[PDB]
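Forum: Protein Structure Q&A
Topic: Joint prediction for protein chains with partners

I've read a bunch of threads here and the consensus seems to be that you should model interacting components together rather than docking separate models afterwards. I'd like to see that in practice. Below is the full input, 734 residues plus whatever partners are listed. Could one of the regulars post the assembled result?
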Amino acid sequence: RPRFSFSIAAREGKARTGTIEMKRGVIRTPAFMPVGTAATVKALKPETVRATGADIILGNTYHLMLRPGAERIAKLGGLHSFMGWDRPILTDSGGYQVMSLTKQSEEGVTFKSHLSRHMLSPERSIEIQHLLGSDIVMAFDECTPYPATPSRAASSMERSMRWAKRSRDAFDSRKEQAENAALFGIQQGSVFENLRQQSADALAEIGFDGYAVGGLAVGEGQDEMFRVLDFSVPMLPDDKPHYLMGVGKPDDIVGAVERGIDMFDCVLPTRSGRNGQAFTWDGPINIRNARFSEDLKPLDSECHCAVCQKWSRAYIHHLIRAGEILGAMLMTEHNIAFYQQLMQKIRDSISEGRFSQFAQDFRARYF
Amino acid sequence: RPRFSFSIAAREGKARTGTIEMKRGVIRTPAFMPVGTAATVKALKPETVRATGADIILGNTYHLMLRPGAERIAKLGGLHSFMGWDRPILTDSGGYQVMSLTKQSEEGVTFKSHLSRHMLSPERSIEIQHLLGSDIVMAFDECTPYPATPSRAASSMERSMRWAKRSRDAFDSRKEQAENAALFGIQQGSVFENLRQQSADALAEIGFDGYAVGGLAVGEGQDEMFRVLDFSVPMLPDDKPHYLMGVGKPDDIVGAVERGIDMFDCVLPTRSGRNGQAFTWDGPINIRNARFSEDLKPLDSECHCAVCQKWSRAYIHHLIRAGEILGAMLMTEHNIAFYQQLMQKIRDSISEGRFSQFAQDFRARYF
Ligand SMILES: Nc1nc2cc3[nH]cnc3cc2c(=O)[nH]1
Ligand SMILES: Nc1nc2cc3[nH]cnc3cc2c(=O)[nH]1
Ligand SMILES: [Zn+2]
Ligand SMILES: [Zn+2]
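Posted by a regular:
Agreed with the consensus. Here's the joint model:
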């Protein structure tokens, strides 16, 4: 098993399907990464997350450094052993969970524990990811508040590129980390093509194992996001994975893949699942609606997840309205399973050169 | 498979071990029944409940008649299909969940929806259990507030015996129910030996498939409960199961078995599990305590449950303090597994004629 090897097996338009081989496992792309912010994919045992088809999950530097603590997790043997997930884990750098969920400077960011004072710099971010034992380390960046003026978008992108270099050097100077994990850079620049180009060029000059498109999924509509992806993704190195941070709505994913994206993550499947929203091939439904109180059909008519094989909408409706934990468990497993099935259909259609048709058929029925 | 067959395979003192064969499965006694009040054993899939070793679970007439509704569950195919548990289910009659969680009369009880007006009589209680598709139906009784004066204990017991007859007749007059389910009577009489005797005699005269000892686990100390069991259990028919309602503390169960009890139920395993209390052979521990933050040992050193095979106290400690659903899931599976292991050790020791010794050894280490 190599430290990192991304191979593209098939293409159609800007879409690609392939694999990323890492020491802890293989990642099938396009891939969807369930979110496990507090060292757990909410309401699911790791074996269940794996059973749905997930090859990798997402962790968070910000949340884990606060609770239970980076040093503590290292003392306990690492995040993998801690939570019981032995496959790849990608960790965000914290560059967004601090300004989202605080004194900023060219050195990093200091903040008040939303739950104490804590400092987070490019060097400390990379070190925390090392202590967690992350497989895919994200460069520490400074996200840009949306909407953003050209001047502000430029300043934030420029700082992010300086921090990208500091992240690269911190990562490379740590032997154990450089030889066993991978480092992804993050493109910034808001919705401005020239800034995106400058960012892409700076990142490519430094060199990374993968390139994320940051600054999206922060309030912009799908039209705008797609517009930015149209010119932004082609700027990134073609032979490396393209990761769209925070994008998860089913239709968003299909459109992003049509534009060259290989990796995704979103709290939608889990967060919405707990809120009563279930994804189906015919569009999302809210199981709390009274019309489901005596509906004996499964969440989705085609889904092959364990939830749809055993329980009815009526039962889950009852569980969610009653505030039962099993309701959260079932809704979450189904939603994550749905997302993985979507990724599988995407991968197979690209491999067979019928992805454009799949996208059309998907949209027609989903909407 | 017979409708009902209780067989005693071995005995030691007042203790007995055996089986109850029913249409939906075999119940090993002494048995512990996990509680599934809202059509779910909180935080556990039915397959997980079964995996821990449970042969039967407990449902509630009161809660289910309010949400999702008895008629609704019947329309949906019954409680078994609804929640996905195909083995025996014992349902309490509601005679305690109304006066615990309201206009009373000789006809029954009317109450305000703690969540509307609803009536509950012996006839309606038996009918609801029928609509739910309960395997073991409990007679509708009137529990006695503890402490209780002799006069009040007598009145409540007398009414309960009149209601026991009405329950018997309602059950027998419903063909489908009489041929496929079983009916258990409930002994009352508070802590008064003469009332317990009168109740036992009235119940035996009517005739039931099993006899529960009611009126305990309502605030009395263990000494008092054991004292009442000492003279109460022997009053019940020897060849039928003896069910102690609501008793679950590990030491309470061991002592109750030493006194002739065959069945138990308690929310302790589940409720306490969610509260951070984990049962171990060395006594209960509260996983929220800071001393467990870096403890890599499993919840219990000997437990063979899936939780103890994969996760550390440190991780569960983190989950519970963070309010994570997986924390509730893991704590609950372990606690229910522990309770079943306890029942297995009890059953095996009785079969081998070394139960008295097991009880001594259990208490010595647990305390
Ligand atoms: N480090 C980092 N993380 C992110 C996470 C996001 N989630 C949704 N949009 C996101 C955007 C970013 C981003 O630009 N940088
Ligand atoms: N029907 C009925 N249910 C009960 C449930 C109980 N739980 C704890 N003590 C309990 C006592 C009773 C009782 O006496 N009758
Ligand atoms: Zn499903
Ligand atoms: Zn255990």
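The radius of gyration of chain B is 20 Å.
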